[PDB]
Amino acid sequence: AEIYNKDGNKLDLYGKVDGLHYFSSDSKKDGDQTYLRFGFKGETQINDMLTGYGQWEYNVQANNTETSSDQAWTRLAFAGIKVGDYGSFDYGRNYGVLYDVEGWTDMLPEFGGDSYTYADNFMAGRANGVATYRNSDFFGLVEGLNFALQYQGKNEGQNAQDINVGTNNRSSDSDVRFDNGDGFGLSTSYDFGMGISAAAAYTSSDRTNDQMTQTNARGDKAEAWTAGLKYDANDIYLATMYSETRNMTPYGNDGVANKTQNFEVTAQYQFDFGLRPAISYLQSKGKDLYNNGRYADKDLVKYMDVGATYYFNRNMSTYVDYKINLLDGNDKFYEDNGISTDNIVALGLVYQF
Amino acid sequence: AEIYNKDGNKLDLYGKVDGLHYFSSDSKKDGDQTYLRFGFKGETQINDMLTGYGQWEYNVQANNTETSSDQAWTRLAFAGIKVGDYGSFDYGRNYGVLYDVEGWTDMLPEFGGDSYTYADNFMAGRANGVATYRNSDFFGLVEGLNFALQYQGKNEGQNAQDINVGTNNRSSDSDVRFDNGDGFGLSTSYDFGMGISAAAAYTSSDRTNDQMTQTNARGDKAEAWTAGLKYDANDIYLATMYSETRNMTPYGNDGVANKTQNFEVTAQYQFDFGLRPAISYLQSKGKDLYNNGRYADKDLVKYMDVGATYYFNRNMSTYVDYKINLLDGNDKFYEDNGISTDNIVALGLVYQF
Amino acid sequence: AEIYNKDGNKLDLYGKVDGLHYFSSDSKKDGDQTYLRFGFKGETQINDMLTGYGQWEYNVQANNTETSSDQAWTRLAFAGIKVGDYGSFDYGRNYGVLYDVEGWTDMLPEFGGDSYTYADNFMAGRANGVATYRNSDFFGLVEGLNFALQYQGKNEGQNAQDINVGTNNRSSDSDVRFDNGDGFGLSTSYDFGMGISAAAAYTSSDRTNDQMTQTNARGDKAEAWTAGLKYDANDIYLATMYSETRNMTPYGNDGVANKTQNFEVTAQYQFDFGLRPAISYLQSKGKDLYNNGRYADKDLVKYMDVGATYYFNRNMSTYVDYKINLLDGNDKFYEDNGISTDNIVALGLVYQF
């Protein structure tokens, strides 16, 4: 929504209101889930080949009481500059380069995008303090090939004992799993012109001393790689992705997997009158999980999804999503770690601007 | 304040800033009370008989320090469809239908509207997970008759060690009084054309397992009913309302009343040059309150209010409100529950958009 | 950024997104420091000599995880009237008159403004519940002489013991150091026309009963005064200020200074091509610090800064700020009171609107 355009500067507001209800036997997911997003995007024309921009995206939950706490948080906040064809650079809270692939399959009515991607988890998704350089023609060598170089500085929690550990942006009571040391990321994507497109991403970062000592994943670095393909043409949206992670992905209340194998696939069709059904599959196979002095292999995430979204227009929509969780509810591992096994049904009515 | 109207979407930002001070010997309310509201109203034209809309209202306190917590919370957040004459349906955090009457007498400069209305109190006021269907002229057959059908799903907090209690949207350390089970609400109003209007509304809801056991109110449902009349014409506003509530409305630090009888009346005139006096009286008589193993009938809220508002224009106003509290300060009952005994004088200067 | 101007009502949205990083050996400062500001400025024309205005400024941190608490708070929120040329009166959360001087030297790239200025510290900076009368001609006596009269109501924390102590707007565990009683403020400024301007301010405030009893600053009133001069012409910006405070300025984890001597200077040049280096010095000499049952004189704040801001245009800028800290590193006073001694280097890229 363009609301300002004077003196070579543009400011657009954007957000949504999601009237959302969950039907699920898991009493931690069942119930009202109404939330909203508010934010702005502005961009200023410095000169004919230079532009500056900043972006804010805020999440505000509306399903708890006005006395409830911590119902609002920021998803994105970054500033950046784009030098025409030479590329762009941004810094702040932005998406991890790994998400350059995961976005292709993070396109379900309500659920999805969570086989291995978590917020504040190295560069798996949205991260604090990422410097991201991107370019749309790979240094002019290949038109249509996107490239990304990304670097994320340390976000380490302090210790009440010695005051020389950590960074400002992690409280002492931080969950150690969502901390990280410094790290870089690489990603690139291509559209072949036939509606078939490919992308891949690679990141590698150090893990904080406290992660090496207090988590049940052993090792000094967190690494990830992903590739994906999508077919987006003739009213069809097909997107699949495979990924692997080492000493990075969390699971349960207090677990890190030394290794994961992850797969997602989403198959969708777009009817001309507004209905968009979608069939999807998501899996995360944990590996070498250190439980009680011994290793074991368990599915951390595994569910099939069927659902549809109906678009009245670009500004209003409603949808249903059915998450059929295939994790074994009779495997005590899940309850023990607090990983839910139950199903969810989502009902959503969404205004956008 | 309409800021967007392009390609079939309309978006208005709205809110106010209230520079507000309270003068009172009750030390938990005396002092600065400055707050502001920010939010939006969005409406999109799907086609000639269909409209989508979304609404956000934010409450942001600005009367405490930049270090304080929980100074901001969401008042309203819903998405909806209006199908011409067939009516409207929306879901999310919206007003309860009991407020179809209470809004008539909650028309004071600053105070008011608090005989039986509490936020997050089933559908007494604003509630989570309420679906509200409204029809504004009975399908175009009868002018001036609005009716509303409303449904509110269960809002209950967990149990510390039982995984069978609660909702996603209520934590265990929530006050159980502002919890609720499923329930429906009905409301209707009619304006006979002479500036007098009559309305009544009725709600009945289940009470949660925790509500029946941890509070001082017994019963398996929480229900309330109310009727009111308003005369709104020729710079005169008289509105009174009567209500009854059973096993729902809270009082004091940790109390819910088995029965309340509540009445409010407001007499206001609007002068041509901008002065709007307000004569109002508000009372809620509690019944069968369980204090220490014995029943009691005591006044929960009882005061007379006088005040005036001066409107500079549609965007600026200032006011003084005098709440003269009629509850007996020497009755040890009140301080025991933390129920106010003191008078309040409010002076506020309000910028609006 | 003007987004509304209809029927004598204007609404401007304003704020910035700062991609900010600090490099510092202090683990309470090192890391990502990315934040954003959001707010509006509204003005309506009541009539030919009357204007209403409201303003909100919000700070939102985006440097901690979506799980973090208290990443957002209000810096400013006030409503007011301007009687044309006769001056202005506004109330709410606004700046203390002392900052009418401090703002001149609080103009460094990143750092600065912290010799003695802290938020919610009587009228040193932003405060709750300030009523401010302003005049652009000193009651008609002297054209060009700005005058300010300001009154701040009691901001006193409640007591769990006596429930008639304190104000509504100070929470259970509130720090009494940032509390305050009643107090008045006076301020004035003049532009001599050759680029030299002078300003001075004086405030005196009562302190709360608990402030006299629970803090290491002895006395029953908190007082401060400041004067400063600036040269702002010929691409040179020179500003200095000297200030003194009594029983008001805080320091460290649990400290109040019985007296402070404060000096700031910032020297800046603005090149025509957009670079603006700035060299500055800031000191606050603490005096009569009752730290361990004994009085002491310590530098509370003392550092030099060198840095530059580069302005792409009115909407985008990037900068570097190098703060060289002069405090005595081998002094147990600092660690014992928790005042950091280390340097910080900041790198920032800023979008503004």
DSSP letters for A56-83: EEEEEE-SS-TT-S--EEEEEEEEEEE-
Q: How far is the alpha carbon of A66 from chain B, nearest alpha carbon, in Å?
A: 5
Instruction: Report whether B204 contacts B183 (CB < 8 A).
Output: yes
In chain B, residues with a C-beta closer than 8 Å to the C-beta of C75 are 66
Inter-chain Cβ pairs, chain A and chain C, closer than 8 A: 170
Q: How far is the alpha carbon of A343 from chain B, nearest alpha carbon, in Å?
A: 14
Cα B54 to Cα A72, A319, B60: the distances in Å are: 18, 16, 20
Inter-chain Cβ pairs, chain B and chain C, closer than 8 A: 171
In chain C, residues with a C-beta closer than 8 Å to the C-beta of A39 are none
CA distance A114 to A264: 9
B78, B153, B163 member nearest A31 (Cβ)? B153
Angle of CA points C166, C169, C171, to nearest 5°: 80
Q: Is A2 in contact with B4 (Cβ distance < 8 A)? A: yes
A52, A58, A76 member nearest C351 (Cβ)? A52
| Other Cβ atoms within 10 Å of B337 Cβ, number | 16
A63, A69, A312 member nearest B46 (Cβ)? A312
C2, C32, C316 member nearest A129 (Cβ)? C32
Within 8 A by CB and 6+ apart from A218, the residues are A212, A247, A258, A290
Instruction: Report whether C176 contacts B55 (CB < 8 A).
Output: no
Three-class secondary structure of residue A172 per DSSP:
coil
- Residue B236 tokens read as 């005169």
Within 8 A by CB and 6+ apart from A31, the residues are A21, A22, A63, B129, B153, B154, B155, B167, B168, B169, B170
Instruction: Report whether B118 contacts B250 (CB < 8 A).
Output: yes
Within 8 A by CB and 6+ apart from A199, the residues are A100, A101, A104, A187, A188, A189, A190, A227, A228, A230
Virtual torsion, Cα C56, C62, C67, C72, nearest 10 deg: -20
Q: How far apart are the two ends of chain C, measured CA to CA in Å?
A: 6
In chain A, residues with a C-beta closer than 8 Å to the C-beta of B72 are 72
Running DSSP on this structure, what letter comes out for residue A183? E
Identify the CA nearest to B309 among candidates B273, B282, B274. B274
Cα A252 to Cα A123, A173, A256, A303, B338: the distances in Å are: 19, 18, 8, 16, 41
| Other Cβ atoms within 10 Å of A248 Cβ, number | 31
**What is the maximum alpha-carbon separation in chain A?**
65
Q: Is B58 in contact with A63 (Cβ distance < 8 A)? A: no
Look at the alpha carbons of C104, C105, C109, C110 in this order and tell me if their dihedral is positive or negative.
Answer: negative
A52, A76, A155 member nearest C31 (Cβ)? A155
Instruction: Report whether B215 contacts B176 (CB < 8 A).
Output: yes
Q: How far is the alpha carbon of C275 from chain B, nearest alpha carbon, in Å?
A: 33
Within 8 A by CB and 6+ apart from C346, the residues are C20, C21, C22, C23, C33, C109, C110, C111, C307, C319, C320, C321, C322, C323
In chain B, residues with a C-beta closer than 8 Å to the C-beta of A65 are 119-120, 128, 170, 174, 178
Virtual torsion, Cα B169, B170, B172, B173, nearest 10 deg: 120
Please name the chains neighbouring B, where neighbouring means 3+ C-beta pairs under 8 angstroms. A, C
**What is the maximum alpha-carbon separation in chain C?**
64
In chain A, residues with a C-beta closer than 8 Å to the C-beta of C314 are 7, 9, 44
Instruction: Report whether C257 contacts C250 (CB < 8 A).
Output: yes
- Across chain C, the runs of DSSP E, i.e. the strands, are 2-6, 9-23, 31-32, 35-47, 50-61, 72-82, 88-95, 126-135, 145-152, 183-191, 196-206, 221-233, 236-246, 250-251, 255-256, 259-269, 275-287, 299-313, 316-325, 344-352
Q: Which domains are seen in chain A, by residue range?
A: 1-353 (2.40.160.10)
Instruction: Report whether C345 contacts C23 (CB < 8 A).
Output: yes
How buried is residue B43: exposed, middle or buried, by Cβ count under 10 Å (0-12/13-18/19+)? Answer: buried
Cα A65 to Cα B111, B130, C66: the distances in Å are: 21, 13, 19
Residues of C near A (Cβ–Cβ under 8 Å) read 1-3, 13, 16-19, 21-22, 27-36, 38, 60-69, 71-72, 312-316, 349-353
Look at the alpha carbons of B59, B61, B62, B63 in this order and tell me if their dihedral is positive or negative.
Answer: positive
CA distance A47 to B170: 51
Within 8 A by CB and 6+ apart from A281, the residues are A263, A264, A265, A266, A304, A305
Running DSSP on this structure, what letter comes out for residue C139? T
Q: Is B158 in contact with A28 (Cβ distance < 8 A)? A: yes
| Alpha carbon A152 to its chain's center | 16
Q: How far is the alpha carbon of B120 from chain A, nearest alpha carbon, in Å?
A: 6
How buried is residue B211: exposed, middle or buried, by Cβ count under 10 Å (0-12/13-18/19+)? Answer: buried
B140: left (phi > 0), else alpha (psi -120 to 50), else beta? left
- Residue B199 tokens read as 């309305």
Three-class secondary structure of residue C220 per DSSP:
coil
Q: Is C168 in contact with B63 (Cβ distance < 8 A)? A: yes
B32, B67, B351 member nearest C42 (Cβ)? B351
Give the residues after which the backbone of chain C is interrupted, taking a C-to-next-N distance over 2.5 angstroms as a break.
Answer: none
- Residue A97 tokens read as 């380069």
How many residues in chain B? 353
Residue in B closest to C70 by C-alpha = B69
**What is the maximum alpha-carbon separation in chain B?**
65
Q: Is A67 in contact with B178 (Cβ distance < 8 A)? A: yes
Identify the CA nearest to C73 among candidates A68, A72, B14. A72
Q: How far is the alpha carbon of C339 from chain A, nearest alpha carbon, in Å?
A: 12
In chain B, residues with a C-beta closer than 8 Å to the C-beta of A332 are none
A19, A63, A313 member nearest B169 (Cβ)? A63
CA distance C173 to C164: 16
B17, B28, B66 member nearest C54 (Cβ)? B17
Residue in C closest to A156 by C-alpha = C31
Virtual torsion, Cα C120, C123, C126, C130, nearest 10 deg: 100
Residue in C closest to A174 by C-alpha = C68
Three-class secondary structure of residue B159 per DSSP:
coil
CA distance B248 to B221: 9
CA distance A315 to B82: 14
Q: Is A69 in contact with C72 (Cβ distance < 8 A)? A: no
Q: Is C67 in contact with A170 (Cβ distance < 8 A)? A: no
Q: Is A313 in contact with B4 (Cβ distance < 8 A)? A: no
| Other Cβ atoms within 10 Å of B333 Cβ, number | 18
Q: Is B171 in contact with A68 (Cβ distance < 8 A)? A: yes
Q: Is A35 in contact with B77 (Cβ distance < 8 A)? A: yes
DSSP-derived pairing of the beta strands B9-23 and A88-95: unpaired
CA distance C283 to C115: 6
Three-class secondary structure of residue B146 per DSSP:
strand
Three-class secondary structure of residue A122 per DSSP:
coil
Element (H, E) at B104: helix B99-105
Q: Is B313 in contact with C8 (Cβ distance < 8 A)? A: yes
Three-class secondary structure of residue B118 per DSSP:
coil
Element (H, E) at B149: strand B145-152
Identify the CA nearest to A288 among candidates A203, A234, A217, A201. A217
Buried b (16+ CB within 10 A) or exposed e, B24-37: bebbbbbbbbbbbb
CA distance A273 to A308: 13
Residue in B closest to A35 by C-alpha = B77
C31, C61, C316 member nearest A46 (Cβ)? C316
Residues of A near B (Cβ–Cβ under 8 Å) read 1-3, 13, 16-22, 27-36, 38, 60-69, 71-72, 312-316, 349-353
Element (H, E) at C209: helix C209-214
CA distance B260 to B262: 6
Question: Residue type for A276, please?
Answer: R
Q: How far is the alpha carbon of B192 from chain A, nearest alpha carbon, in Å?
A: 35
Three-class secondary structure of residue C210 per DSSP:
helix
Instruction: Report whether A225 contacts A243 (CB < 8 A).
Output: yes
Residues of B near C (Cβ–Cβ under 8 Å) read 1-3, 13, 16-19, 21-22, 25, 27-36, 38, 60-69, 71-72, 312-316, 335, 349-353
Three-class secondary structure of residue B106 per DSSP:
coil
Cα B234 to Cα B21, B281, B291, C199, C315: the distances in Å are: 32, 22, 48, 54, 51
CA distance A242 to A246: 14
Please name the chains neighbouring A, where neighbouring means 3+ C-beta pairs under 8 angstroms. B, C
Q: Is C169 in contact with B35 (Cβ distance < 8 A)? A: no
Look at the alpha carbons of B337, B339, B341, B346 in this order and tell me if their dihedral is positive or negative.
Answer: positive
| Other Cβ atoms within 10 Å of A279 Cβ, number | 14
CA distance C65 to A75: 9
Instruction: Report whether B92 contacts B53 (CB < 8 A).
Output: no
Three-class secondary structure of residue A44 per DSSP:
strand
Q: How far is the alpha carbon of C101 from chain A, nearest alpha carbon, in Å?
A: 31
A73, A166, A178 member nearest C27 (Cβ)? A166
A3, A91, A154 member nearest C349 (Cβ)? A91
Instruction: Report whether A66 contacts A54 (CB < 8 A).
Output: no
Instruction: Provide the CB-side half-sphere exposure for C235 (13 A, CA).
Output: 9
Three-class secondary structure of residue A200 per DSSP:
strand
Three-class secondary structure of residue A233 per DSSP:
strand
Element (H, E) at B103: helix B99-105
Q: What is the resolution of this structure in A?
A: 2.6
Site from B26, B38, B64, B309 to mutate, C interface, most C CB atoms within 10 angstroms: B64
Within 8 A by CB and 6+ apart from A94, the residues are A76, A78, A126, A127, A130, A132
How buried is residue C293: exposed, middle or buried, by Cβ count under 10 Å (0-12/13-18/19+)? Answer: exposed
What's the alpha-carbon Rg for chain B, to the nearest Å?
A: 21
Cα B43 to Cα A16, A113, A246, C305: the distances in Å are: 12, 30, 47, 51
| Other Cβ atoms within 10 Å of B184 Cβ, number | 15
CA distance B28 to C162: 11
Instruction: Report whether B251 contacts B289 (CB < 8 A).
Output: yes
Cα B7 to Cα A15, A279, B83, B246, C66: the distances in Å are: 17, 32, 20, 49, 34
Which single residue is written with the structure tokens 């969390």? A250
